[PDB]
Short mmCIF file of C-alpha atoms in Angstrom, two decimals:
data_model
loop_
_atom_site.label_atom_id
_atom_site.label_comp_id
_atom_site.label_asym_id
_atom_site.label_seq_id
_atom_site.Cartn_x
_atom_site.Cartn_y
_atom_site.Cartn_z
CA UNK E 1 -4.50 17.00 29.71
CA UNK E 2 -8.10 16.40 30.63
CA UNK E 3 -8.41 12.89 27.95
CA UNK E 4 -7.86 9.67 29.72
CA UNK E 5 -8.54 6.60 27.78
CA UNK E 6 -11.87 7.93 26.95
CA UNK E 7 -14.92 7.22 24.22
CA UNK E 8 -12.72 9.79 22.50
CA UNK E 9 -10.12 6.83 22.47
CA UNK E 10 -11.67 5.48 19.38
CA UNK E 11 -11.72 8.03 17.46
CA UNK E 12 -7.84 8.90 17.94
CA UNK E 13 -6.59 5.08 18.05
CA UNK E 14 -9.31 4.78 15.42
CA UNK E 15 -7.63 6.75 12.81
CA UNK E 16 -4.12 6.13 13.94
CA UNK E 17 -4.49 2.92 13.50
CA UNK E 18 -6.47 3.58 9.81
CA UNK E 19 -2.77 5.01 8.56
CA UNK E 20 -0.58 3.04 10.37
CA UNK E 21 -2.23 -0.45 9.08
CA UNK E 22 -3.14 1.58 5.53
CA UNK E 23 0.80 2.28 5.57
CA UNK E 24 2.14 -1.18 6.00
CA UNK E 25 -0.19 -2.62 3.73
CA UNK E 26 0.18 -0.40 1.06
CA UNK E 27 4.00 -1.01 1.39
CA UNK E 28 3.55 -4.59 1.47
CA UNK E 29 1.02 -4.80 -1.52
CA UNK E 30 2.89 -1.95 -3.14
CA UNK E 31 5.90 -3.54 -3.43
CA UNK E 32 4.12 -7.10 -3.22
CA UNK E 33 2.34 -6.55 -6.21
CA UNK E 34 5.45 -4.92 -8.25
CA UNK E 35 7.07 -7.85 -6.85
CA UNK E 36 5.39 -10.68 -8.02
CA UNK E 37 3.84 -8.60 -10.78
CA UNK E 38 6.73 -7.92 -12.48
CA UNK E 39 8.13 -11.45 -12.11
CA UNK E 40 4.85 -12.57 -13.50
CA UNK E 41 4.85 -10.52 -16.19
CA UNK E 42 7.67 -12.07 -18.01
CA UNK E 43 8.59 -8.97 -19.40
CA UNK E 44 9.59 -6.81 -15.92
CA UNK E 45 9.74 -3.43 -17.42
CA UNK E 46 6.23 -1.93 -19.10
CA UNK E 47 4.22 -1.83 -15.42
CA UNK E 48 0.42 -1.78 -16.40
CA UNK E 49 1.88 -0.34 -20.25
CA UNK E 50 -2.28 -1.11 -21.18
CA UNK E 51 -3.35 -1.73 -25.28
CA UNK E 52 -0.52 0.78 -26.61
CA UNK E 53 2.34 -0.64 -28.23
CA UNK E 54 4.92 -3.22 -26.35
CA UNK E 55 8.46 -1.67 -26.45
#
């Protein structure tokens, strides 16, 4: 309405662009981490089990 490509434009792209790059990445390193993580692992099944037991 009144905005146009103001100082306010950091603040708005500034925190769009804090979840949009926070998404991807925690998709990618979500996933990523599983990924190789589990493959890694050699057991692909306990996912961070800790000191308790292996089953």
């Amino acid at each position: 309405a009144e905005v146009k490509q103001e100082s306010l434009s950091g603040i708005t792209e500034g925190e769009a662009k804090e979840f949009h790059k926070i998404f991807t990445s925690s998709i990618l390193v979500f996933f990523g981490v599983a990924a190789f993580a589990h493959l890694l692992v050699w057991i692909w099944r306990p996912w961070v089990p800790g000191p308790n037991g292996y089953s």
